[PDB]
C-alpha cells in the first residue's frame, strides 16, 4: 500500500505503539487549546456537519468523531491504525452512538470505506507541522471525499523566523566539551569532541521561547489541504527572505504552525505561535552551524528544504545568507530525533 | 536528550 | 543467531539506535559512581588482568577496555553492536592502544574471536538489573571464556522490599482517573477507566526514594554469572516472604540491585540500593492497583515472575498476599515501558 | 389532620424534637454570639415595631427572642415551641418575672390555638443551607395569625450559591469512597459496590467553612420574601444559575450560604452566614460534583439547583451544571438531611 | 463521624 | 413480631437508616481489631464451619458470611434488616458465592429460614455491650439452631470498675454553669442550671482512659449466649462489691466488654478492655452525681441495674455506697444518648 | 461531641 | 513524559 511503500516497518511499529497508550491520548486531549479549538471549529460550523457523512482520519480515542456527532452528523467513519481503535469502539458503544460512528481499525491507505463523505476531519499535525508524515495520510483520504467536500482543517501554515539565542548556541559546545579532556579516568576523549558537536547540531530543539528573540517577521508557507496532493509533501522547499527588524547574531530558524478550519459559518484558527498560549506542539528551533551577523534592515535569504524519509519524518536542510555581506551558514538536521529542552 | 519514540511532546 | 531469534527486529533497531549516540555514552560515563566503581574493581584487581586476554561485551565507547589496558592486559577484544564501535576505534587510535585493544563490531552472539579469553568484562545491567536482556548476551559470551576464567561483574543481586508511598500511588491513580470523567467536552470516558488503570499501573516507576518507605527487610535473588546459563533468564521466579516491620498500606514492591566484582585481590561492590549514593539506574518500584493493609509482624508472601519478551525486556508478574488476612494483589507490569519520575 | 403531620414522617419528627429538647443544644445556639447578638440588635434597634404590640415567637426554644421582644416593650408575646424545651422556657419566664407578658404555648405552630392575631412574628426558622428543617414553612404557616398590617422578623431570606474549587475536599471524600474499590479486603472483593459508595459519599453536603479564595465566580442570589411567600412556595424551589467564571480551574461543586434581613421601621439589620463574614454555627454548605468540571475564566457555568421538599423535614437536592463552551455536564443528587459535618 | 442522622443544627465554633 | 412489640417504630427507622450507609459498614470494617478477630475466630475454628449450615444475624455487607465461606461452610443464610441487605446481595454475586450464601432481607424475628443451622454467627455487641438490644435478636435466632449447635460469639463478659477522674466530673459543672449568669443578653438564666447539670450527668461518656484511673479490680457479669433467653436481657442486675485498691474520690463506674468465640479447636477472645488496643466500641463511663471517698481497703458495694426500653437501649440505674462510712451516691443514665468525648 | 443517631461510634 | 520509549538507560542524576 501507499503507507507501506513509504515507511520502514520498524519505524511504523514504534510509531503506532506510542499511539496505543491511553496516556498519550490523554496528553493530547488535555491540551485545552488543541481540544477546545477543534470542538469550537466543529460546533460553530454545525451546518457543515448536520446530516452529513464524515471521515475522521487517525481518530485515536475518537474525540473528534464525538464532536462531529455533537454537531449533528448523520454518519461518521473513524479510522485509526493503532490499537487505540479498540478503545474508541468501547467509547462509541458506551456513548450510545453505534448507529452514527463506525470505527474502522487500520491505516486509511488500506481500509475500505463504503461511502464517499462530505467532509474529512483529522489532527494530522506533528511538531513543526510536518513530522509524522500524517499530512500525507490526511491528503490521501481525499479519494473518499465528494467533489466540493470540505476539509477540517482546511489549510496549514508553517511559519519560519530567524532568532538570536546565544545561550542555546553555546550550550551545544558546553555539552560536547565533555569529550575535550585528556584524561577522563586516564583516557583521552578529545578525538570525539567534533563528532559530539555534529551530533548536537543535527537535533532540532523542541521547546518554547520569549518572542523577543525573533529578529524578523515570519515567512509563511501555506499548505491548502483542499488543493494539495500528497506528492506535494515529499519535497517541501520553503524559500525565505527575512527583512531584519533587529540587529544581532542570528543563530538559527524558529518554526511554528497554524491551521484554519474554513467552515460555511466562520473560520476558526488553531495556532502554535510563540505569541499564543503554549500547546503540546511547543515550537521548534534549528540552529545554524555558525551565527550570522545581520543589521536591522538587512535581508536574510535562503531556503529550508524538507525531504521526507521512511522514518515518518523529514531531513531538514537549511541554508541562509546575509545578502548585504555575503556571510553564509547552513545546517542539516534530523527531525525524527529532536532535543526536548523545555523546563 | 534522546527520546526516540516520543512522537508527540508531553503537554505543558 | 541466538540474538536474532529472541529479539523483535524493530526493538533492536531502536535499542541500538539509542546506544549510537555520543550523548548517551556521556550520560553513563558522567555517572561517577558507575564509572569510578568500575575503574576501582579493575585496577585494584590488576592481577586478574596483567598479561591476560580480555573480552569486553558491549563496550560502547570502550571505557572498560581502557581500564583493562591500564591494569596490564595483553589483549582486549571489545565487542559492540551499535555504531558506537566506530567511535571506540577512534579512541583506541588516539590513545595509542591499537596493540592492546581490538574493537570487533557486532553482536557478541554473531562475531568471531581469534582465541579464548581469561576474563570477560561488561556492563550488562539495565534498570531493575534485567531490562535490556543484556545479561543473556553476557552469559552467551562465556563460550569464549577459558575454563576457570573470571567475569567482571561476577554475581548480581536483586533486592525487592515492600514499600508504602501514598503520594506515588495517588499520583498514578489520579492520572488514570482522567478516564473516569463522564462528560469530557460532553463525552463519557468512564468505560475506559478500567483499561487506563491497567495501563498506568503496568508502568514501573524509575526514581529514588527515602529508605523509610520500606516496610520489611529485602529479599535477595542472586544470579551467579560464573554458573548461570542463558536459559536461566528466560523465566525468573522470585519467591518472597516478608516479615512486616511496620503497620500500614503496602503499595507495591521496590527493586534495586548490587553487582560484585570478585577479584583475586579484593571484592568490589557496585550497588544501586536506596541506602547508597544515587546512580543512573535509580531504583524501580512496581505498584499494586489496590494496596494491601498489613500489621507489623504479619508476613507478606507471594512470587515475582519475570518472563523475557522479544522486546529485550521482561513481562513482570507480581502476586502478593497478606497471609494473616488472605488479602491478595496481582499485577502485570511492562518493564520495557517505565515511568521515569526523577 | 395538621399541616405539619401531613408533610412530616412521624419518625423524622420524633428525632427532630428530641434533638431540640436538650439544654446543651440551646446553649450551643445561644453561645453563637453573632446569631444571638444580631437578633437582639434587630429587635432592640427596631423597638417601635414591638412597643405595645402583640408578638408571636415561632419555635422559641428557651425563649430568648421572646425576652428580646419583651425588652423592646411588647405588650404580649405568645411563644410557641413543640419540643420539651417549652417547659424550660416557662421556668425562665417565671424566674425573670415576665409571666404577665410572655405566654408559652407548647406544641406545633400548625396545631396550637393562639388567643388573638399578632402584629409581628419573630422566629429562627433557618437551618443549615437555610432550607433544612423546613421550619420556613412553619414560619410562613404562622401568618394565619398575622394582622394585615403585620411584619415578619426575619423579613426576607437570601440564598447565595457560587462555584468553588477545593481539590483537597474532593479527594478527601473520594478517598473514603475508594475503600469500596478494594478487590481483596480480608480476601473479599468489594469493588462491585464502588459505584454505590461514590454515590453515597457525594450525596452528603459538606457543612464547614472555607477561604473565600476558593470561589470561582460571583454568587447567584435566590430571595424568599417571608412577608409575601406562601407555604406551598417552598415545596419545589428552582434556582437557575449562569456563572461568569472569574478564574480558570476545576469546579468541584457549588457553595451555599444565606443572609436574612430584619426589615424594621427604624432600620434593616442583616444576619449573614457568608464566608466573608464572621463564622456562625450554620457555617456554609458545599455540594460536591462526583466529577469536577473544567472551566476557563470567561466561560459560563449554567444550570439549575432544584430543591424538592421531603417528608424528613428537609430537601432532596438536584444540581445540574454545564460548562456552556464545552458542554461538559455534571448532574448530582444530594440528601440535605444527612450531611458531613466536617469542621 | 461520617453520619450524625439526628444532629439538626451544627455544633457552634 | 417480637421485634416490633419491643421497639418504637421511630427508633427502628433511624436505627436501620444508620445501618443502611456503606460509610457505617466501612467504619466497622476498618476496625482491624474487630474484623481481624472475627476472621481469626472463624478460620482458626474451621471444623466448626466446614460443610456446615450457618446463620449470620445482622450481616450488614456480609463480611462474616464471607469468612464463614472462607472456612468452608456449605450454606450460609445471611439475615439483615437494613437496606444494606441489597448491597450484601451484590457482593455475594460479585464474589461468585450465590451457591453458598443466601441473603435474606428482613428482621431475624420475622423472616423464614428453610432449615435449621449448625452455628449462628453475629456481631450483636453495641457500646457497653447491651446498647442496640441486638443481643435479644441473636438469642431469638436460636429457634433456628439445631440442638448441638454453637454460637459465635459464645459468651459475653461485661466488666464494671470504679474510677477517679476529677476533671471529667468538674467538666459537667463548667458546661452547665453557662446557665448560671444573671444577665445573658439581659436574661437571667440561672433557674435552668440545675436542669442542665442533670442533663449532662444522664449521659454515659464514650471514650477511653488510662487504666491508672481504675481504683478496684473489675467485677464481671457474663451472658452465656448458648443458654440465655431473650427475657433475661430485659432486666439486668449487676451487683458489685469493690475492694478498693487505691484511696481517693470515686466519680463513677467504667464499663467494657469481652466476647469469646468458643470453637472446637480453640477459643478466641475479642476484648474492648482499656488494657487492650482501642476499638470503635471504646469504653463507657457512668458518673455518680456525687463522688464517694474511699480509702484503700474500703468496700464500695451497690448495684448497676439495666432496664431495656423501646428505643433499642437501656435505662441505667447505678447505686453505690462506701460500706465503712455509709456515704451513698446514685445516678440515672440514658444509654441511648451518650457523650462522645474521645478526641 | 453528642452523637444523636450514631448507633456505633466513629472508629479510632 | 509518561512514555519515553527508546530511552533504554535513565538519564543520569
Ligand atoms: C497526530 C495524529 C496521530 C494519530 O493518527 C493515527 N495515524 C497515523 N497515521 C495513520 C494512518 N496512516 N492511518 C490511520 N491512522 C493513522 C495515529 O495512530 C494517531 O492516533
Ligand atoms: C547497558 C549497556 C549495554 C551496551 O551493550 C551493547 N549491546 C547490547 N546488546 C549487545 C549485543 N548482543 N552484542 C554486543 N553489544 C551489545 C549496547 O549497545 C550498549 O553499548
Ligand atoms: C432552628 C430552631 C428551630 C426551633 O423551632 C422549633 N420548631 C420546629 N418546628 C416547629 C413547629 N412546627 N412548631 C413549633 N416549634 C417548632 C424547634 O423545636 C426549635 O426549637
Ligand atoms: C452492631 C451491628 C448490628 C447489625 O445487625 C443489624 N440488625 C439489628 N437488628 C436486627 C434484626 N432484628 N434483624 C436483622 N438484622 C438486625 C443492623 O442493621 C446491623 O447491620
**Is D184 part of any known ligand binding site?**
no
Q: Domain check: are A210 and A137 in the same one?
A: no
Q: Domain check: are F159 and F148 in the same one?
A: no
How far, in Å, is the centroid of ligand 3 from the Cα of D139?
9
What values do phi and psi take at C144, rounded to 5? -95, 0
Strand (E) positions, D44-133? 54-58, 76-81, 102-106, 118-123
Catalytic-role residue among C48, C56, C132, C157: C132
Q: Give the CATH number, domain containing residue C140.
A: 3.40.50.150
Q: Domain check: are A84 and A143 in the same one?
A: yes
Please state, in angstroms and rounded to a whole number, the distance separating the CA atoms of residues F78 and A48. 60
Catalytic-role residue among D49, D90, D124, D137: D124
> Is H3 close to A14, i.e. CB distance below 8 A?
no
Q: Which of A18, A27, A340 sits opposite H5 (nearest CB)?
A: A18
Q: Domain check: are A3 and A100 in the same one?
A: yes
What values do phi and psi take at C270, rounded to 5? -115, 110
Residue with cell 450457618: F54
Q: Domain check: are D115 and D172 in the same one?
A: no
C132 classed as catalytic: yes
Domain's final residue, options F153, F173, F188: F153
Please state, in angstroms and rounded to a whole number, the distance separating the CA atoms of residues D132 and C196. 41
* Grid cell of D277 as nine digits: 463574614
List CB contacts (< 8 A) between F21 and chain D. Answer: 200
| Structural contact between residues A94 and A104, judged by C-beta atoms closer than 8 angstroms | no
Specify burial of residue F274 (Cβ count, 10 A radius: 0-12, 13-18, 19+): buried
What values do phi and psi take at A65, rounded to 5? -65, -40
Please state, in angstroms and rounded to a whole number, the distance separating the CA atoms of residues A60 and F183. 74
Q: Which residues form the domain of F161?
A: 155-343
- Please report the atom of ligand 3 found closest to the CA of residue D83: 18
- Asked whether the bond before C333 is cis by omega within 30 degrees of 0, the reply is no
The string of DSSP codes covering D262-298 is EE-SS-EEEEE--TTS---TT-EEEEEEEEEEEE-TT
Q: Domain check: are C140 and C69 in the same one?
A: yes
Please state, in angstroms and rounded to a whole number, the distance separating the CA atoms of residues D66 and D124. 11
Domain's final residue, options A105, A134, A153: A153
Q: Could you tell which of A2, A80, A110 is best to mutate to test the pocket of ligand 1, judged by most ligand atoms within 8 Å of the CB?
A: A80
Domain's final residue, options D98, D120, D154: D154
Secondary structure, 3-state, chain F: CHHHHHCCHHHHHHHHHHHCCHHHHHHHHCCHHHHHHHHHHHHCCHHHCCCCEEEEECCCCCHHHHHHHHCCCCEEEEEECCCHHHHHHHHHHHCCCCCCEEEEECCCCCCCCCCCEEEEEECCCECCECCCCHHHHHHHHHHHEEEEEEEECCEEEEEEEEECCHHHHHHHHHHHHHHCCCCECCECCHHHHHHHHHHHHCCCEEECCCHHHECECCEEEEEECCCCCHHHHCEEEEEEEEEECCCEEEEEEEEEEEEEEECCCCEEEEECCCCCCCCCCCEEEEEEEEEEEECCCCEEEEEEEEEEECCCEEEEEEEEEECCCCCEEEEEEECCCCEECCC
Q: Domain check: are F159 and F138 in the same one?
A: no
How many other CB atoms are found less than 10 A from the CB of residue F308?
21
C80 lines ligand 2 (CB under 6 A): yes
Where helices occur in chain C by DSSP H, the ranges are: 2-5, 9-19, 22-29, 32-44, 63-70, 84-94, 134-140, 166-177, 193-201
* Grid cell of A133 as nine digits: 508524515
Residue F27 forms contact with E (CB below 8 Å) = yes
A81 lines ligand 1 (CB under 6 A): yes
F164 bridge partner residues: none
Residue G11 forms contact with E (CB below 8 Å) = no
A57 bridge partner residues: A79, A122
How far, in Å, is the centroid of ligand 1 from the Cα of H7?
23
* Grid cell of A79 as nine digits: 479510522
Please state, in angstroms and rounded to a whole number, the distance separating the CA atoms of residues F240 and F254. 13
Catalytic-role residue among C123, C136, C157, C165: C123
Q: Domain check: are A172 and A67 in the same one?
A: no
Number of H helices, E strands in chain C: 9, 16
Residue with cell 522547499: A237
- Minimal Cα–Cα distance from D187 to chain C, Å? 4
- Please report the atom of ligand 2 found closest to the CA of residue C126: 1
How far, in Å, is the centroid of ligand 3 from the Cα of D82?
6
| Structural contact between residues F26 and D179, judged by C-beta atoms closer than 8 angstroms | yes
Please state, in angstroms and rounded to a whole number, the distance separating the CA atoms of residues F291 and F293. 7
Please state, in angstroms and rounded to a whole number, the distance separating the CA atoms of residues A279 and C80. 40
* Grid cell of A339 as nine digits: 532535543
Q: Domain check: are C174 and C303 in the same one?
A: yes
How many other CB atoms are found less than 10 A from the CB of residue F122?
23
Q: Which of E1, E2, E5 sits opposite F17 (nearest CB)?
A: E5
A56 lines ligand 1 (CB under 6 A): no
| Structural contact between residues C221 and C306, judged by C-beta atoms closer than 8 angstroms | no
Q: Ligand 3: which residue has its CA nearest to atom 7? A: D59
Q: Domain check: are C266 and C125 in the same one?
A: no
Please state, in angstroms and rounded to a whole number, the distance separating the CA atoms of residues C205 and C342. 9
The approach used to solve this structure was: X-ray
Resolution in A: 2.0
Specify burial of residue C335 (Cβ count, 10 A radius: 0-12, 13-18, 19+): buried
| Structural contact between residues D286 and D254, judged by C-beta atoms closer than 8 angstroms | yes
C123 lines ligand 2 (CB under 6 A): yes
D221 bridge partner residues: D160
Residue of F34, F62, F65 whose CA lies nearest to F52: F65
Q: Domain check: are D313 and D216 in the same one?
A: yes
Catalytic-role residue among C31, C171, C198, C315: C31
Q: Ligand 1: which residue has its CA nearest to atom 5? A: A58
Report the number of distinct structural domains present in chain D.
2
A164 lines ligand 1 (CB under 6 A): no
Helix (H, G, I), strand (E, B) or coil at D194: helix
Which whole-number Å values give the CA distances from F110 to A61, C247, F2, F87, F104, in the listed order? 54, 43, 8, 20, 11
Q: What residue in B sits closest to A284 (Cα-Cα)?
A: B9
Q: Domain check: are C137 and C222 in the same one?
A: no
What values do phi and psi take at D207, rounded to 5? -100, 105
| Structural contact between residues C141 and C78, judged by C-beta atoms closer than 8 angstroms | no
- Please report the atom of ligand 1 found closest to the CA of residue A84: 20
> Is H8 close to C30, i.e. CB distance below 8 A?
no
**C325 Rama class: left (phi>0) / alpha (psi -120 to 50) / beta:** alpha
List CB contacts (< 8 A) between G2 and chain D. Answer: 22, 24-25
C241 sits in which H/E element: strand C235-243
Give the CB-side neighbour count of residue D121, counting CA atoms within 13 A: 30
- Asked whether the bond before A298 is cis by omega within 30 degrees of 0, the reply is no
Residue of F85, F83, F110 whose CA lies nearest to F4: F110
* Grid cell of D241 as nine digits: 444559575
Q: Could you tell which of F4, F13, F25, F58 is best to mutate to test the pocket of ligand 4, judged by most ligand atoms within 8 Å of the CB?
A: F58
Q: Give the CATH number, domain containing residue D238.
A: 2.70.160.11
* Grid cell of F66 as nine digits: 464471607
Alpha-carbon A158 to chain mean position: 9
Amino acid at each position: 500500500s501507499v503507507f507501506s511503500e513509504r515507511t520502514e516497518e520498524s519505524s511504523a511499529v514504534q510509531y503506532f505503539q506510542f499511539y496505543g497508550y491511553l496516556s498519550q491520548q490523554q496528553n493530547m486531549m488535555q491540551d485545552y487549546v488543541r481540544t477546545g479549538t477543534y470542538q469550537r471549529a466543529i460546533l460553530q460550523n454545525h451546518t457543515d456537519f448536520k446530516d452529513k457523512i464524515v471521515l475522521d482520519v487517525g481518530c485515536g480515542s475518537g474525540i473528534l468523531s464525538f464532536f462531529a456527532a455533537q454537531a449533528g452528523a448523520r454518519k461518521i467513519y473513524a479510522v485509526e491504525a493503532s490499537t487505540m481503535a479498540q478503545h474508541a469502539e468501547v467509547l462509541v458503544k458506551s456513548n450510545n452512538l453505534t448507529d452514527r460512528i463506525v470505527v474502522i481499525p487500520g491505516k486509511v491507505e488500506e481500509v475500505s470505506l463504503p461511502e464517499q463523505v462530505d467532509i474529512i476531519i483529522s489532527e494530522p499535525m506533528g511538531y513543526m507541522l510536518f513530522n509524522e508524515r500524517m499530512l500525507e495520510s490526511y491528503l490521501h483520504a481525499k479519494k473518499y471525499l465528494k467533489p466540493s467536500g470540505n476539509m477540517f482543517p482546511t489549510i496549514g501554515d508553517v511559519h519560519l523566523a530567524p532568532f538570536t539565542d546565544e545561550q542555546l548556541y553555546m550550550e551545544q559546545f558546553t555539552k560536547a566539551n565533555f569529550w575535550y579532556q585528556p584524561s577522563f579516568h586516564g583516557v583521552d576523549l578529545s578525538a570525539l569532541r567534533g563528532a559530539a558537536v555534529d551530533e548536537y547540531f543535527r537535533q532540532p530543539v523542541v521547546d518554547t521561547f520569549d518572542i523577543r528573540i525573533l529578529m524578523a517577521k515570519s515567512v509563511k508557507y501555506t499548505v491548502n489541504f483542499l488543493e494539495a496532493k500528497e506528492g506535494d509533501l515529499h519535497r517541501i522547499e520553503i524559500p525565505f527572505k527575512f527583512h531584519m527588524l533587529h540587529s544581532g547574531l542570528v543563530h538559527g530558524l524558529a518554526f511554528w504552525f497554524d491551521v484554519a478550519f474554513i467552515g460555511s459559518i466562520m473560520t476558526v484558527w488553531l495556532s502554535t505561535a510563540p505569541t499564543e498560549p503554549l500547546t503540546h506542539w511547543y515550537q521548534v528551533r534549528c540552529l545554524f552551524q555558525s551565527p550570522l551577523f545581520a543589521k536591522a534592515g538587512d535581508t536574510l535569504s535562503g531556503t529550508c528544504l524538507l525531504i521526507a524519509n521512511k522514518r515518518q519524518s523529514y531531513d531538514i536542510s537549511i541554508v541562509a545568507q546575509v545578502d548585504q555581506t555575503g556571510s553564509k551558514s547552513s545546517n542539516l538536521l534530523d527531525l525524527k530525533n529532536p532535543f526536548f529542552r523545555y523546563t | 536528550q534522546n527520546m526516540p519514540g516520543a512522537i508527540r511532546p508531553a503537554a505543558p
